[PDB]
Amino acid sequence: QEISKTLTSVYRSLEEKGYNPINQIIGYVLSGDPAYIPRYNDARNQIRKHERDEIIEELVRYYLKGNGIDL
Amino acid sequence: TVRFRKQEISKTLTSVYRSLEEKGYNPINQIIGYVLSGDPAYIPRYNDARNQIRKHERDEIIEELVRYYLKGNGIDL
């Protein structure tokens, strides 16, 4: 559950800083550029615990399970 | 034809997974490779899987994956 906790915390810190949190997270996943995630409230340091391919693996597994795949 | 439960991405990614599974490949690994690279060559032609992935851009796939995850986990809610 680490990745869901990270993305939750990052979304809420993005929101508090007045960013569009979805756009910034999409930007991070596209680019791997930590600059899309503010340093505020440790958000950038939290997302850097994971590798982008681990984040993508979780997004993909979650999406497929929710759309009817038995993993 | 309706799917009983964006919907095109749902159709594409589930169909790609099942075709990769039928051909004995690691489907998650191949899908991750596509998402990181945008390269349709990570997807076999088999059962129209590559044709379906090529209906989308990598950023549209990533946008849907991110939006679906946040909404489903109650973060964007």
Contacts of A69 in chain B (CB under 8 A): 14, 17-18
**A26 vs B contacts (CB less than 8 Å):** 59, 62-63, 66
Is the alpha carbon torsion for A63, A64, A68, B3 positive or negative?
positive
Q: Give the number of other CB atoms < 10 A from CB of residue A56.
A: 22
Which has the closest alpha carbon to A40: A21, A63, A58? Answer: A21
Are B46 and B23 in contact, with CB atoms under 8 Å apart?
Answer: yes
Which distant-in-sequence residues (6+ apart) come within 8 Å of B19 by Cβ? B44, B46, B47, B48, B49
Q: Which residue of A has its CA nearest to B33?
A: A53
Residue with tokens 């060559």: B41
Task: Give me the DSSP letters along B3-54.
Answer: ----HHHHHHHHHHHHHHHHTTS-HHHHHHHHHHH--GGGS-SGGGHHHHHT
